[PDB]
RNA sequence: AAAAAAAAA
């Protein structure tokens, strides 16, 4: 017999229902998650039995929407699901992203949350079910795990926030922002607003989390009800006697070290200090573990750079908090793509091309919610020879398919609509150089390149990452941090929008709580550092090209007859292939009968019209049509015309006067106009050549 | 001027033509096998050399079709031959599964038997003839290998066995079975049959073996004639001192720990034990080898669990052999799905889950016998925390893609056809705790989720998985074998089908000498035991649901008369394609006039049967004729009815007099009625609206 | 291949049938394409030279011009 | 012989 421990609750307007214990029992724990009809199977495998050596938390969260959820059979050709979608491996970064920092310091064990989708209702998106899945599963396992977790989901609609909106109701709002904290204080925010102004954001993020405080009182509930024992895991014990040893030496010279200006030389000191408290440490003793050393250095950096920047001293780079790194915008850098920009900030830089084409290129996504045909593709490639090291390129990584939809959320705010701009623009923007806050910069990048190919955007965006650091309640802010500060640093929080509001935020605290007003001080240094980088951005291009780019696609539009769309198609479109062929474009075909000519240049787009029209041209009366026969025999030459239709000039039909031979009647080149009477129907169109030849 | 050595032999109607020293002379042997113009080229490369420590054997059989064997260009946008598909790698398996026992113990050599297909007769299926290459080229290459192995794929018409039959006939067999097995004993048997009774099924089985016997006799022959010298390998001899201060000094007290009943304690004990064993042996002797310790161990444990169920004490969970474990059954487990049911056996489980799709879904597979549509879709999903550890997720592996086919011959025999019943049935079973038996439990589910979702299937089905262990003279046959059962077990049976007859016969024996009246008593405890299971699935689900449920896409079928297609319809698919896209349905035509509704909902349904009926709308007498006349001309009244039924009013049936403005007599939109007079070949349609206004 | 035969172009609607359905039934049963063009040239395109001999052979039952000294199956359905 | 335009581218 099966015992299922069912616990629902009402959260907004479902009644989420937490059921475990009767499916996957061989798991760790497995929680079947499920608001109102929309369900989600999460589960989690811990093993028990640390890798030997083992230096980073190796936690791994795959996300599987099968399709037959939505209830319907797969598209692929292999008729099944296969490697995760882009979506999918968004909402698994999505899922991750909150968990990581709550595992206490020095965990190493393997786990593994494989949260699945058996069954989905359109009005209600899983995601948001997911993750309080992941919480419940993590929670009831017994794996060290600080806190359940809630997650929420916040719209704007009228003025007033609401909680977990419907799909319906998320077309009407201005803000779809997901907000995932601990009892104590906010986790994440990964949301994509619509030019609102910091304070309605903030607002926003209060919101969600003080609500979905009721997801984590009832996650506990659960927890205490039919939960398993908490692992015997302690951490390793501080070796204060080692640390006390190497901080005795090493702590005054890496502060001088780290205290003078330029930066390669204290690589190379820091280097060798490194390798000559190595070498101490190991032939002192043999046993040490290099790891362990390593470990002790990472502390010492971290230890003496956060004392540092607390105190107000300068900071590695050698700027204050506020100042940002210089800039150098760059435009039309790349000769034939339809617009192009590179945008240089320190060493952070993101050559960006944008690249019209026309609605047969919008990709057309097949997701559990609904179909859906997308017309702003940003893609975002992250290179190995960017952070100066080899690698294998391949597939995106993970990391790269979060920081496209990032860049494309800090975008899609100022987009114009589609009836005012009949494209599909794709982004990508490629990062030659990273140093920190890649992503924003791939942004400001993507606001140039649009204004530049010529898309009417609104006004253009720029992203800024920022830090924070903070010990008790002595706190400061940073600015445009690099990636060796975000490492200590306790915060990294990037907003992305235009001079008039907030475009996107992602937040990602990592320690104890922060305030309210922290975030809103955060949020204004934010909003200044923005505005700067706006104006220098502005100083190249103000105002988007006139035009597009030669280059790109032009529009040209022909209206045909509802028979000739499928005249055009001929078989399995072998017409519309030659044409294409032949003319070098790309013409799109609708049941109504309208053409649409895309082309390059000019020329190309009229040869395009003629070549159709002489088939579409329907032949008139009185007026002659240009024939010519491709084939003569004794018995009679019949003058193909073309348009699927073709009229036979019999021999018993040219004259009374026997035709000995066509080649003596009809030469090879005897262009003749042919005098037509009518349009016949029976397949055997009259032509004659006889009238037209009498003078 | 190298030459071949040909040894052919008749196998049936078809002659088989063995063939070696002609080609991949480099490869340790390699032999193209030819039957009836099909040829597959079998190739084995065996290393010398065991990798240092190596401890499973690692030998892989690939399996390519090349489809430049039918004479054709692949259909995939490279052109070239991708990986393998799911028949290649069934096939794969097919190969494996009989030669893995075969090889010696300790062999550890790695081994791999490539299989190219290179030219297919659409008739002659080239598995069979890929299992007689794999067994000539390994009997061939001198790798040790106890003997040639001989298939068949008996057929059963008209109540009597066929040997080898080729597709045309095997349209109407019922029963498939490849009986593989070597002269002693039959190694392995793949069946699929429309509920034939047991009796029946063995007797395939006998038959098969004695008919290929022919081929093991010549290809011992050809291997007598151009073989090459066997290697020289000795098994590894057993150490007899660790042998005796392992068993002398435990073996006892693991034979204690085995009688306690429960699981944990003994788990306790056991742990314990080894322990122990281990310690005083490191003690004795730290050089002694810890692996070969545990190796040892297992040897032990397992020779005290096979002596136990031999006497016939309790097994290792404490049923008796015949009883099966405990069950639990429900249907309609999630929400939204089309059907699903939760079959949970003992500490096995699968959440299976059908989900109808219309006609356009059917995966359309090309393999070398000819394109062929499958409309019956089954996918086994084998996720990680199933077994309680973490993992990979990713593409399917090979033993799913096995289990998969396994489970759908099962279900198979039992499913409706295609008149009865237009759908896509694909039915996903995601194994959520496996402990044995998996498969089959994933059938029982698919046959309670194929009875919810409302297909009518003719008859639930079940599976059930034997297990045999034998000695000497003595055997004891086991049923719902577990998991750890099975390594100790020697041969597994799989038996799966109604109370009726068998569907599915799948069996790996190992041992050699099993009489064809174990195997009955056998496949009589297996019919006991598949008939308990089906009476416990009784109780949920009694019989097929008369309606499917309401998300389900839903299809209807009405008859048309099939001249008048072309009428309604007209050239160019302009009014299917409008219809299609107004009603958002799809409508095919049939040559009889057969057409199909498909759409996700009634209402659209029904009003696209409207659409369909107006157009096709008869001449019923004393139904109202409706025409609305916005516009006269001098010519005739033009009215928009649909259909191109127009009809030129005359002015001569207006009035006596000239009409100097018709507007006068004739009102503009009031209704005239009109009777068709007639309906000539030229689509002459005629209005009468004097006779029509009396009558 | 491709199978070209010339056959009288007046000829083609007797065979052609009422809205194509001899066509269409005589490619469905031999599983080729057969393409006739006004002038009566009569092209058979097959997959393999099986197919196209079948194909060929039903074309030359039916669609063969008249010819003196075949005879015709002529079977009574009722009395 | 009824019909845009390719995971198986």
Redesign the pocket.
């Known amino acids: 017999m099966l015992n299922p421990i069912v616990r629902k609750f009402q959260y907004g307007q479902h009644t989420v229902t937490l059921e475990t214990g009767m499916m996957a029992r061989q798991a760790t724990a497995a929680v079947m998650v499920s608001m109102d009809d929309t369900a989600v199977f999460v589960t989690v495998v811990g093993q028990k039995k640390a890798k030997p050596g083992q230096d980073f938390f190796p936690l791994t969260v795959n996300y599987q929407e099968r399709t037959y959820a939505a209830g319907r059979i797969?598209?692929?050709?292999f008729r099944r699901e296969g490697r995760p979608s882009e979506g999918e491996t968004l909402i698994a970064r999505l899922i991750d992203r909150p968990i990581r920092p709550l595992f206490p310091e020095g965990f190493v064990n393997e786990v593994q949350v494989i949260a699945t989708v058996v069954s989905v209702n359109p009005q209600v998106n899983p995601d948001i079910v997911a993750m309080i899945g992941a919480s419940a599963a993590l929670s009831l396992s017994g794996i060290p795990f600080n806190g359940p977790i809630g997650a929420a989901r916040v719209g704007y609609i009228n003025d007033q926030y609401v909680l977990n909106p419907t799909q319906d109701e998320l077309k009407e709002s201005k803000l779809d922002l997901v907000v995932a904290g601990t009892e104590a204080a906010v986790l994440m925010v990964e949301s994509e607003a619509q030019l609102l102004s910091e304070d309605q954001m903030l607002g926003a993020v209060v919101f969600g989390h003080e609500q979905q405080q009721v997801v984590i009182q009832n996650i506990n509930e659960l927890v205490k009800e039919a939960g398993k024992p908490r692992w015997d895991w302690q951490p390793e014990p501080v070796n204060e006697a080692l640390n006390a040893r190497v901080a005795a030496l090493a702590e005054a010279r890496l502060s001088d070290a780290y205290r003078i200006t330029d930066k390669q030389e204290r690589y190379a000191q820091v280097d060798v200090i490194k390798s000559e408290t190595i070498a101490t440490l190991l032939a002192e003793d043999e046993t040490l573990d290099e790891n362990e050393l390593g470990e002790i250095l990472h502390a010492i950096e971290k230890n003496v750079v956060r004392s540092r920047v607390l105190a107000g001293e300068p900071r590695i780079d050698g700027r204050e908090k506020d100042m940002i790194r210089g800039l150098d915008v760059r435009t039309g850098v790349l000769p034939r793509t339809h617009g192009s920009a590179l945008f240089t900030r320190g060493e952070t830089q993101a050559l960006v091309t944008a690249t019209l084409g026309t609605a047969r290129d919008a990709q057309v996504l097949?997701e559990l919610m609904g179909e859906r045909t997308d017309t702003f593709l940003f893609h975002y490639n992250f290179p190995p020879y960017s952070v100066g090291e080899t690698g294998m390129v391949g597939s995106p990584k993970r990391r790269e398919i979060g920081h496209g939809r990032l860049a494309k959320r800090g975008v899609l705010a100022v987009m114009p609509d589609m009836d005012k701009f009949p494209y599909t623009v794709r982004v990508v923007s490629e990062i030659t150089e990273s140093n920190g806050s890649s992503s924003m910069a791939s942004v400001c990048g993507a606001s140039l390149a649009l204004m530049d190919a010529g898309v009417p955007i609104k006004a253009a965006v720029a992203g800024i990452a920022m830090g924070l650091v903070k010990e008790g309640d002595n706190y400061v802010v940073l600015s445009d941090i690099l990636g060796d500060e975000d490492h200590l640093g306790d915060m990294d929080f990037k907003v992305a929008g235009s001079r008039d509001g907030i475009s996107a935020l992602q937040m990602d605290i990592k320690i104890e709580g922060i305030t309210k007003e922290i975030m809103q001080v955060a949020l204004n240094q934010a909003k200044g550092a923005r505005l700067h980088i706006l104006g220098v951005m502005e100083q190249a291009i103000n105002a988007p090209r006139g035009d597009i780019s030669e280059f790109a696609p032009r529009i040209h539009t022909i209206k045909i007859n509802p028979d000739k769309?499928?005249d055009v198609?001929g078989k399995?479109?072998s017409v519309?292939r030659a044409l294409t062929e032949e003319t070098g474009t790309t013409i799109e075909?609708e049941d109504d009968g309208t053409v649409k000519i895309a082309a390059t240049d000019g020329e190309k787009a009229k040869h395009a019209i003629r070549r159709i029209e002489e088939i579409t041209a329907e032949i008139e009366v009185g007026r002659v049509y240009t024939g010519k026969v491709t084939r003569i025999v004794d018995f009679g030459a019949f003058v193909a015309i073309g348009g699927g239709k073709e009229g036979l000039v019999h021999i018993s039909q040219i004259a009374d006067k026997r035709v000995e031979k066509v080649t003596d009647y009809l030469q090879m080149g005897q262009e003749v106009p042919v005098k037509v009477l009518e349009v016949d129907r029976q397949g055997r169109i009259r032509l004659s050549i006889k009238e037209a030849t009498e003078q």
Do not use: H
Request: proline share 8%; no cysteine.
């Open positions: 797969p598209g692929s050709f097949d769309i499928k198609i399995g479109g519309i075909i």
